[PDB]
């Protein structure tokens, strides 16, 4: 009886697992969450889609009636920290290649950027310690942003010219595109500090310096590696089109806006109603109220426009779309420089970039010369509204977690002053595109969703987790 047989034969020897073997997991782990359930609920909070009348999976997200114990992001919390963040820590232990450490640090930085944009605080300086600290403290969201921006900075400064020697499913070893990913992340987080009025003087100048260098990325920063297979699909499609039936329908703010502006992108991911052949959105949280008011057979799935899942099976997961990067530039020019012509240029560039991804290349003029023409944006506020409202359209069916956060930073689309019931009763009071507070709203304080709940697993296993607070509580960088 050889008792020395407790080496798990179902796994390789730990020596044989080098950093090139671990690294590809990190981008995939992250995209599983950010393009998956986080993308999924963020689509509701950003008011892109709503709950289909004839099924019932997401009633509590739409009506804001989930609670901390609903675990609405425990799956993603586990993926990001015990999947990706741990793999990243192992990569940085196993390789000394500054180029690899740079891509690893960027991806690590993005992970904390997603968790902070959900629950404000996050474990950070004490995370990933194992038994040395089973209960890490949750750092403030400002400490986390400030720290990972310095990590990116110090990892970039470490580059020596050598090349990447790890499998890169994002950029395929193109260090220039990775530096562009990080400067676009710097731009995103600098504007968060600015509109949080926290060292807003430096970050205004830093964002000015950043946009001047134009050292950003080309294409979209994405994970383009999915197959219409099994366990190989886009997460949001895999969960919502294979795991469940069709639950999502188009929401009213997105439909009314795409209809007002004459946008042909209204056909991408949205489907005309199977009953009259038009586009109809459902007022957030108003599934049960619409059945109450109209009756059972008059508010069925056929009476509302359904979110199309067919473009989804192999659709990639986006980390930073090009249209959004152009729109941030457009903002930086419009309100930090005195450059209306560069603003118009970056604005148009984003709308053009998105029309091309959604397969309507060559049609952008229908909004760039119609209702969303920069010419008809008189005030510098009517320009900012136009940049923000098109940033919002741009992020539909691409990166919903960002859409939610840019709604929160810039508070555009504005929240309408009318109720869901007032909009349903007389449509003329509604400004197409404005968000509608949910008809059933579990937030004692009312309004729109400001954060996610702390993960229940952290709650139960970590005494140092901040106490649950209602959904209405802003994240440290949302101050209005």
């Amino acid at each position: 009886c050889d008792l020395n047989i407790n080496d798990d034969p179902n796994y390789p020897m730990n020596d044989q697992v080098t950093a090139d073997l671990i690294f590809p997991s990190i981008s995939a782990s992250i995209a599983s969450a950010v393009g998956g359930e986080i993308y999924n609920y963020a689509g509701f909070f950003a008011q892109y889609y709503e709950q289909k009348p004839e099924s019932n999976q997401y009633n509590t997200l739409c009506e804001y009636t989930f609670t901390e114990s609903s675990q609405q992001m425990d799956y993603s919390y586990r993926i990001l920290f015990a999947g990706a963040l741990e793999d990243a820590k192992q990569v940085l232990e196993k390789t000394t290649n500054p180029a690899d450490r740079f891509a690893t640090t960027i991806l690590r930085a993005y992970a904390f950027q997603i968790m902070v944009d959900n629950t404000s605080d996050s474990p950070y300086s004490e995370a990933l310690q194992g038994n040395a600290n089973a209960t890490p403290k949750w750092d403030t969201g400002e400490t986390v942003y400030k720290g990972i921006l310095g990590e990116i900075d110090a990892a970039e400064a470490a580059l020596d010219g050598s090349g990447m020697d790890v499998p890169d499913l994002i950029f395929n070893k193109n260090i220039a595109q990775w530096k562009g990913f990080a400067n676009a992340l710097r731009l995103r987080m600098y504007l968060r500090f600015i509109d949080a009025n926290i060292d807003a003087a430096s970050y205004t100048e830093k964002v000015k310096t950043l946009v001047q260098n134009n050292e950003f990325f080309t294409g979209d920063v994405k994970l383009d590696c999915f197959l219409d297979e099994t366990d190989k699909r886009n997460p949001w499609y895999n969960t919502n089109a294979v795991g469940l039936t069709g639950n999502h329908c188009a929401a009213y703010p997105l439909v009314s806006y795409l209809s007002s502006t004459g946008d042909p992108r209204i056909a991408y991911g949205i489907s005309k109603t199977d009953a009259d052949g038009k586009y109809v959105g459902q007022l957030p949280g108003g599934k049960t109220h619409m059945q109450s008011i109209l009756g059972t057979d008059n508010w069925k799935n056929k009476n509302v426009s359904a979110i199309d899942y067919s473009i989804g099976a192999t659709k990639p997961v986006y980390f930073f779309t090009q249209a959004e990067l152009q729109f941030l530039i457009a903002e930086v020019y419009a309100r930090f420089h005195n450059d209306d012509a560069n603003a118009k240029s970056a604005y148009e560039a984003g709308v053009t970039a998105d029309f091309a991804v959604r397969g309507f290349a060559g049609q952008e003029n229908t909004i760039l010369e119609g209702a969303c023409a920069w010419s008809a944006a008189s005030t510098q506020a009517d320009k900012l509204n136009l940049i923000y409202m098109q940033k919002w359209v741009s992020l539909f069916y691409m990166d919903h977690m960002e859409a939610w956060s840019e709604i929160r930073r810039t508070d555009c689309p504005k929240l309408s002053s009318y109720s869901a019931a007032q909009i349903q009763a007389s449509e003329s009071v509604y400004t197409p595109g404005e968000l509608v507070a949910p008809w059933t709203n579990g937030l004692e304080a009312g309004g729109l969703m400001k954060r996610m709940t702390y993960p229940l697993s952290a709650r139960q296993q970590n005494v140092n987790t901040p106490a649950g607070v209602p959904g209405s509580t802003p994240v440290w960088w949302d101050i209005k």
Partner: protein, 945 residues
């Protein structure tokens, strides 16, 4: 033996076997104190749970060590690892023994003198002893031939007031019964086929689900051949069982076949004996779950719809594309006729023993056991999308909400290979001196257990119906797995005896385990037991027997395989209702494993204290046994939950004490006894106190055992019993009143989930009677288990679907929740106001779906029941009628098991003897639309030659 110093119970095979259950254990349900025996379901071939003095292992090995002659028996269970979507159960290792072969079964309940069988004995021991040789009259052939039916025992009590619809309005297509009150008017229903639709009177069909079932049928054949000499004996047996249960078609199937051959020959001081057994089984299962399964599809039927009218597939309206409802369910007769979940298993086990007596008082014994099994699963489901999606309402007409998306077919096959080897070398010494008696035993143990399997899966079938790994144009999925563990030990057991009055025993064993850290493999555990029979050397003759008992001792234990060193898994990511797995895309990847290994582990140690009293009176016409035990399982190695922010989701460490304390009480007597008539009564009582004592503070005091995400979950919490439930309750004002929503009327969820009871019965007991009049026998046993709670998806689905009688609560008129307030929140000012908002008719469906004022906790259901467990009517024919015949004996027998169940007022839904999560701890969470339990009754013919 019965110089023992702790609780034990003996049953002979005749009681084991009279019930004619396929299984050696399920007949003893509720017949023995401290031995909690339950079946996983009524599905043929399913597993049996047996927990002795509560749960000690937090995950998840609580079955006792089955020991057959006397070699450990494999008791591995084969059940689905995803009980939510593909629940099934294919049997456990003890279900293979043929009850007709059992002579004696003795259950050792205490864990203080386990040196003989090792660590597994802390969960208790079930010692079985098989039949041997004659001589008798005349040839030695015993036949048992049986036949038995099963019918459905308890279905949920339904409302028959309202029919198909939603929001209280009429519908032609719902999977539920929130429509109008029954009219008798002619309304439409179902889909439309070829510009035609079905039209029927709007009336209730209260028997519709009940009529869906058939009568299960089962036929058994058992033979045995026997004989002996003054130096040798020989037994050879065969058993056959073929069950096709009450669910229609052949999906409830279990075929059992066994063959055995046992012999012993003595030549001088040497004795060599050998036992060799082969077991076959073919299970087929009607899969359970929340998707396109039979029962889930069956409960989701309007009260007015004729279910048995859906079986004819030449009726277009029953074809999958025109089925009357497209809401996440399918025609139940299609699912049973077109899905596959088969299991076939082959198993060989046996032993060799060499006994050799030498020098008057010594005896050498070598015993070696081998148990090996090859099992092979085959599951498949059709490409529903290819066959039925285009052109039908259910269909392209549903778009992304069709039950056929993305149901593109799937087929998997798995071959498991199990193998255990046990070797014992012993020396016994037995010598009387001056009234004393000495019995020493020194031994060695060597154990080797191995399991491996090979899995392979294909999706998206090319030919829709063919189930073959060639039938896919997409990547196949392969998985391979193997575990191996070894143990060696040395043990000694000293028996001291004075004049058959004072018996003493001292046990000691040291083990070396492969599953503990290399620097800490060795653990030692001793024990001591005593027995004092004050009957002998106490006149009367009133006290037949009087024995007092006491024990203190320890049983060590190791951990599950591969818990010390870290591993790296092939990268995968578990997302809601799916995965994202590597390779992607052309790249393979590895990830850091989520369970932190530990090389600081130390062994597990269970310590028990026990005292007991046994007395008989009036020549055994009155007899009672009482035991009091205090059990502490410490340092059990367990994958304890941890904050994912640490980089791992669990860390393996030694837990705290899991304590089981209680009382085991047995009382029997024979109030009447004449020459031709006897009446016996038996009453047994068990009360166990369960308490996790501590769970390592550093990671919290809580850890999940099983539980839904954002739903009801069963925990192990520090100062609480094993299996605490938490579930969503509604918010209350400081004064008791229920908070509801100002606009909808529906309850408001509280901030945290509420504790909602535990898994444990507060007490268990059983009462038996046995009449004998000449040749006739009668036995009636009642099982009584009271207390605890379990999750029930059968109540869940019947609330949601508007079919449970409870949902007819207010005649479904608009109603204001009684005692309701509104919570007026302005910034930080909290104010409560009498609620004025009714729950509208259109929203009542949602009041009940969420669980009424109880919310999620509504679906934790009381575990308590009283059960007519078994009734056996036996007729032994008078020996005189058999004389000009070849027969030595003839006994006809009628029986019935699981005959009637009584539950408290609040549970009108399930027979609580149900799970979808296996036969051990995790099964206690509840039932996930497990199939209905059945009522069984048959005949048996016994024929001695």
């Amino acid at each position: 033996e019965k110089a023992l110093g702790y609780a034990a119970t003996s049953v002979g095979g005749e009681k084991i076997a009279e019930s004619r259950t396929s299984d050696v254990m399920s007949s003893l349900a509720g017949k023995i104190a401290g031995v909690q025996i339950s079946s996983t379901s009524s599905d043929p071939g399913a597993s049996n749970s047996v927990i002795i003095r509560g749960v000690s292992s937090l995950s998840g090995t609580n079955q006792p060590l089955y020991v057959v002659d006397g070699v450990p028996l494999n008791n591995s269970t084969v059940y689905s690892t995803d009980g939510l979507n593909s629940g099934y159960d294919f049997g456990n290792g003890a279900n293979a023994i043929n009850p007709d072969d059992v002579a004696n079964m003795t259950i050792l309940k205490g864990a203080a003198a386990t040196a003989l069988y090792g660590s597994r004995a802390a969960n208790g021991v079930v010692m079985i002893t098989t039949k041997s040789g004659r001589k008798e009259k005349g040839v030695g052939i015993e036949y048992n031939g049986g036949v038995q039916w099963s019918t459905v025992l308890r279905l949920p009590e339904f409302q028959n007031e309202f029919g198909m619809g939603w929001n209280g309005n009429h519908t032609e297509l719902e999977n539920g019964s929130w429509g109008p009150r029954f009219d008798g008017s002619m309304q439409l229903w179902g889909n439309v086929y070829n510009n035609s639709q079905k039209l029927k009177p709007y009336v209730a069909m209260p028997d519709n689900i009940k009529d869906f079932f058939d009568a299960g049928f089962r036929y058994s054949n058992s033979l045995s051949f026997n004989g002996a000499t003054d130096k040798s004996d020989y037994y050879v047996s065969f058993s056959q069982i073929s069950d096709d249960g009450m669910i229609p078609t052949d999906a409830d199937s279990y075929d059992k076949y066994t063959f055995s051959a046992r012999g012993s020959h003595k030549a001088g001081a040497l004795t060599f004996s050998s036992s060799l057994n082969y077991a076959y089984q073919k299970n087929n299962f009607a899969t359970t779950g929340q998707g396109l399964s039979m029962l889930n599809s069956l409960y989701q039927t309007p009260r007015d719809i004729s279910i048995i009218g859906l079986e004819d597939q030449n009726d277009p309206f029953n074809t999958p594309g025109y089925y009357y409802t497209p809401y996440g369910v399918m025609n139940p007769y299609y699912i049973l006729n077109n899905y596959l979940n088969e299991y076939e298993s082959e198993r060989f086990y046996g032993k060799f023993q060499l006994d050799y007596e030498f020098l008057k008082y010594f005896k050498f014994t070598y015993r070696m056991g081998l148990d090996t099994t090859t099992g092979q699963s085959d599951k498949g489901k059709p490409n529903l999308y290819a066959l039925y999606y285009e052109g039908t309402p259910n269909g392209e007409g549903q778009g992304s909400s069709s039950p056929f998306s993305g149901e593109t077919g799937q087929y998997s096959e798995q071959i498991t290979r199990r193998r255990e080897i046990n070797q014992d070398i012993m020396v016994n010494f037995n010598m009387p001196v001056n009234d004393f008696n000495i019995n020493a035993l020194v031994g060695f143990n060597g154990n080797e257990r191995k399991v491996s399997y090979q899995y392979s899966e294909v999706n998206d079938l090319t030919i829709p119906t063919w189930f073959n790994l060639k039938n896919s144009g997409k990547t196949p999925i392969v998985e391979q797995h193997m575990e191996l563990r070894r143990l060696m030990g040395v043990f000694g057991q000293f028996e001291g005896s004075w004049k058959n009055m004072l018996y003493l025993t001292v046990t000691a064993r040291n083990d070396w385990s492969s599953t503990l850290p290399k620097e800490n493999r060795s653990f030692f555990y001793p024990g001591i037991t005593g027995s004092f029979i004050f009957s002998e050397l106490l006149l009367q003759d009133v006290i037949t027997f009087g024995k007092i008992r006491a024990s203190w001792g320890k049983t060590g234990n190791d951990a599950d395989v591969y818990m010390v060193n870290p591993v790296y898994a092939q990268s995968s990511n578990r997302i809601p209702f799916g995965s994202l797995t590597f390779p992607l895309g052309g790249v393979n990847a590895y990830s850091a494993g989520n369970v932190l290994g530990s090389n600081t582990l130390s062994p597990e140690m269970t310590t028990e204290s026990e005292v007991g009293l046994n007395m008989a009176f009036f020549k055994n016409r009155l007899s009672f046994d009482v035991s009091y035990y205090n059990r502490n399982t410490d340092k059990q190695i367990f994958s304890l939950a941890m904050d994912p922010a640490s980089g791992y989701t669990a860390q393996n460490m030694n837990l705290g004490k899991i304590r089981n304390r209680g009382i085991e009480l047995l009382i029997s007597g024979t109030p009447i006894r004449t020459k031709d008539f006897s009446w016996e009564l038996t009453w047994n009582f068990t009360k166990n106190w369960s308490k996790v004592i501590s769970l390592p503070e550093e990671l919290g005091g809580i850890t999940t055992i099983y539980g839904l995400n954002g739903g009801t979950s069963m925990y192990a919490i520090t100062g609480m019993p094993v299996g605490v439930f938490k579930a969503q309750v509604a918010e209350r004002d400081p004064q008791g009143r229920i908070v509801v929503n100002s606009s909808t009327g529906l309850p408001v969820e509280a901030s945290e989930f509420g504790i909602c009871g535990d898994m444990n019965n507060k007490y268990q007991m059983g009462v038996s009677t046995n009449l004998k009049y000449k040749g006739i026998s009668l036995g009636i046993d009642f099982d009584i288990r009271q207390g605890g709670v379990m999750y029930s998806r059968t109540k869940d689905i019947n609330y949601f679907t508007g079919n449970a009688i409870q949902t007819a609560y207010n005649d479904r008129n608009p109603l204001i929740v009684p005692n309701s307030v509104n919570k007026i929140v302005n910034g930080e000012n909290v104010t409560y106001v009498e609620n004025t908002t009714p729950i509208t008719s259109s929203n009542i469906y949602k009041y009940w779906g969420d669980g009424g004022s109880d919310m999620g906790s509504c679906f934790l259901v009381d575990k308590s029941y009283v059960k007519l467990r078994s009734v056996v009517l036996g007729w032994d024919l008078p020996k005189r009628w058999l004389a000009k015949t070849p027969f030595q004996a003839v006994k006809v027998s009628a029986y019935g098991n699981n005959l009637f169940v009584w539950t408290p007022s609040s549970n009108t839904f399930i027979d609580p003897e149900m799970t979808s999560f296996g036969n051990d701890l995790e099964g206690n969470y509840g039932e996930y639309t497990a199939n209905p339990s059945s009522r069984r009754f048959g005949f048996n013919l016994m024929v001695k030659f």
